[PDB]
């Protein structure tokens with residue numbers, strides 16, 4: 001009887017940050033209530049000033065990470081205000097039945113809907129918009145995110161001992177296919193609707209024009225770099241709703257990786273680089289051991305350094321010469 | 333002494349269906365006899381009426397699934413009738429030596445051959461044609477299939493308890509590279525031989541024009557949708573002889589997945605999406621929990637919804653509101 | 665105190681061969697000293713005589729495999745002689761901190777540097793050049809290799825029993841992006857520097873013009889085929905610094921595979937084909953059971969047979985008819 005369960009309202013935060021939650025569950029099953037507002041907006045995605053009409057959950061690319069526990073109920077109020085132009089919906093890969101909720105969540109501009117589902121399987125899972133006949137266009141315009149369903153006793157290593165993270169970040173990787181004129185310049189449109197047939201032709205090439213973390217080239221750099229301290233345990237959740245990726249932390253490793261993101265399986269250990277298939281979210285746990293700048297990249301290095309799939313960590317603390325040292329500095 | 337073993341003749345069925353077999357072996361080792369006839373035929377692969385000269389085992393794309401048990405002998409009579417034009421052969425990834433049988437099975441039009449091999453390793457494995465110097469052309473013209481070698485005591489979960497499927501389906505995914513004129517229209521040829529150099533140029537782009545299940549856009553939809561009932565245990569075998577794929581059941585999961593298809597390994601649990609590398613067959617076990625339409629897609633959604641890698645399941649039975657429900661239907 | 669540890673000087677050998685080493689460690693931790701000299705050179709990569717300006721460690725593509733044990737220190741003297749033109753460095757994915765050593769190893773032509781790091785994690789790992797702002801150009805010009813960090817007690821199977829290899833080979837797979845004129849002919853340059861902007865444009869296509877083992881189309885064939893004897897245990901280390909690959913031994917299997925190359929994890933068994941993600945090294949163990957020619961391919965067969973990702977093994981010994989036999993040779 002769901003009416004006797006506690007309800008809790010969560011306010012979502014912008015990626016790469018994640019709303020507050022408990023790793024080990026301090027209550028029994030709950031109905032966890034979320035609200036999301038669809039926003040169609042103009043987004044500038046690179047240094048050149050290239051602009052797309054992005055389709056977003058809650059104003060961001062990716063949409064926010066939702067965090068619940070196994071056997072919680074998720075109740076999502078989804079709002080499509082009348083300032084938008086398109087029909088949208090939501091498919092949760094975490095959910096069972098009705099096209100992951102897609103069949104029950106079709107909202108025209110001006111409409112809302114509330115969907116509930118039980119989170120029966122632990123792991124990180126993609127969610128994405130998927131309207132009949134326009135599925136890839138919505139997804140590759142930025143309309144995807146992820147949900148983490150933690151086991152009620154938190155994460156476990158390959159032996160079954162607890163793993164506790166001190167910080168968690170969410171990296172949404174987005175493949176864009178900006179249409180081009182005959183000469184290779186990116187085209188501009190006044191509405192999302194105008195671009196439809198050119199977007200289809202751009203997608204059919206299977207060649208993205210940009211691949212970005214958190215919605216833009218350089219989004220996770222400078223003042224927006226991810227931060228940590230030597231000795232901190234960091235969980236990085238990474239999703240790609242449409243195309244394969246191969247994350248790598250330059251200067252580090254994935255100590256424990258769930259590459260396909262499902263926590264009933266034991267993690268892979270000591271990974272240099274791991275494959276997250278398109279349509280999947282994965283999770284990597286790392287304990288930082290050296291201070292400095294680290295780059296976190298898709299290790300197709302063309303995709304990383306030319307197309308934009310690179311961000312930075314800035315890590316504070318003490319340098320350990322036993323792990324690494326320059327014996328003779330560069331010289332004649 | 334193979335002469336003292338029982339022989340059994342199996343008649344193959346068209347995909348996505350699979351010939352009858354026992355999961356747990358009810359006899360000792362056998363010589364299981366199969367026959368396949370190579371057919372070159374004109375195939376229409378999309379709604380636009382685009383036609384290719386397909387090269388098939390037994391008239392279908394994919395070729396039929398063969399099912400044996402570990403330590404059976406497979407004996408394959410392969411017939412290339414004189415109405416064909418090309419030399420063909422067969423490489424079984426399940427087999428050991430002679431290029432998977434490829435070196436011993438070269439048949440000109442008018443010839444047959446009989447190959448025997450011992451199925452020493454359990455799993456689902458690709459088979460494909462592979463004639464010297466024309467390997468990708470044959471494979472990407474549809475000349476591939478799969479064989480399942482069951483452990484003699486059937487399938488096991490990650491703990492080692494039996495897993496029993498009520499139904500089994502075989503999904504062959506095929507990347508095609510239809511050559512195009514200067515303007516982007518698909519070219520037409522009277523024979524397979526005519527297309528050779530244009531096919532090579534189309535392949536070298538690494539960009540397929542179509543990606544289909546069971547030989548055509550929409551082949552596993554409408555009246556040809558896969559069927560099941562709530563509470564049935566379904567095994568889906570999926571192969572791709574040439575290009576990576578990432579299957580996903582929309583509205584469901586892969587409860588137990590052997591992504592690289594080899595049953596001595598424990599399955600991966602609770603998968604949303606899994607990667608089957610090109611040149612591999614994989615297997616996913618699911619128990620249906622909700623009725624309705626499910627889409628089974630390659631979750632590069634461009635490949636799925638624009639290039640054709642999508643099919644449907646229609647599932648009958650009772651709807652479970654505890655797993656999912658619409659709390660407030662779409663409205664103002 | 666590193667000053668009390670034994671030092672040992674190793675001389676590197678050209679791939680596909682590997683310097684001598686012990687599987688099970690016969691000493692305690694050591695500082696293992698290597699030297700590498702960067703060479704920029706003109707390389708012919710195909711039968712047509714297409715030439716690139718390759719950037720190499722020690723004159724080869726890939727660079728040589730370095731082999732140490734877990735908790736050894738690696739000390740690398742890296743020399744950029746003044747006959748080169750570019751700035752280079754080295755990132756070891758095996759190492760912790762400073763961008764895998766990249767931040768500390770920047771050497772102009774005329775300079776050297778010596779870097780030390782502790783090999784804390786067992787597995788096969790990529791190393792590659794990664795100079796600020798020119799990372800993919802260096803990597804895709806051939807400037808990558810691998811290091812194997814063996815557990816001190818050698819390799820173990822999934823149950824934990826020893827696995828001992830009789831031979832080891834290293835296959836570096838290289839994606840090249842040779843720039844093309846308007847008509848599709850490959851362009852030629854007098855220096856590496858001249859090509860820079862055309863190379864960037866070629867890379868941005870995400871479509872390699874060639875994919876090769878050991879630096880050229882046909883490099884591991886004929887007189888340069890890999891050799892083995894029936895009953896030998898062979899370890900094949902395989903790396904790809906930039907793009908996903910899916911190795912397959914035609915006529916054989918991967919009996920034990922570490923697809924993502926990290927030995928604290930149990931191997932995958934009985935693989936037909938496995939995915940090594942770009943930015944990763946993997947390892948496959950096989951025991952040969954039949955004599956003859958075997959092809960070792962990337963099983964995107966276009967990439968293999970049209971773009972060049974294929975080599976051969978020649979295996980000597982006795983033919984086993986129980987595993988495979990031609991019952992009726994090709995005939996009318």
Ligand SMILES: O=N[O-]
Nearest residue numbers: 040041042053054
């Ligand atoms: O500006 N709205 O796409």
Ligand SMILES: O=N[O-]
Nearest residue numbers: 242243244278632
């Ligand atoms: O689905 N593209 O990796």
Ligand SMILES: O=N[O-]
Nearest residue numbers: 243244245246300
């Ligand atoms: O091909 N996907 O990175």
Ligand SMILES: O=N[O-]
Nearest residue numbers: 258260261262265
């Ligand atoms: O789904 N594997 O963590």
Ligand SMILES: O=N[O-]
Nearest residue numbers: 332744774775776
């Ligand atoms: O290049 N050594 O000074």
Ligand SMILES: O=N[O-]
Nearest residue numbers: 372373374385386
């Ligand atoms: O019609 N035969 O390709």
Ligand SMILES: O=N[O-]
Nearest residue numbers: 574575576610964
């Ligand atoms: O081999 N192409 O994924």
Ligand SMILES: O=N[O-]
Nearest residue numbers: 575576577578632
């Ligand atoms: O790139 N293979 O879907």
Ligand SMILES: O=N[O-]
Nearest residue numbers: 590592593594597
């Ligand atoms: O090969 N793994 O099931």
Ligand SMILES: O=N[O-]
Nearest residue numbers: 080110111112664
């Ligand atoms: O958009 N709410 O009616």
Ligand SMILES: O=N[O-]
Nearest residue numbers: 704705706717718
């Ligand atoms: O010839 N040196 O690139």
Ligand SMILES: O=N[O-]
Nearest residue numbers: 300906907908942
């Ligand atoms: O990163 N390309 O498979």
Ligand SMILES: O=N[O-]
Nearest residue numbers: 907908909910964
């Ligand atoms: O797409 N990498 O073979």
Ligand SMILES: O=N[O-]
Nearest residue numbers: 922924925926929
């Ligand atoms: O990293 N897996 O062997």
Ligand SMILES: O=N[O-]
Nearest residue numbers: 412442443444996
């Ligand atoms: O094609 N049989 O002789």
Ligand SMILES: [Cu+2]
Nearest residue numbers: 088129138143
């Ligand atoms: Cu939408």
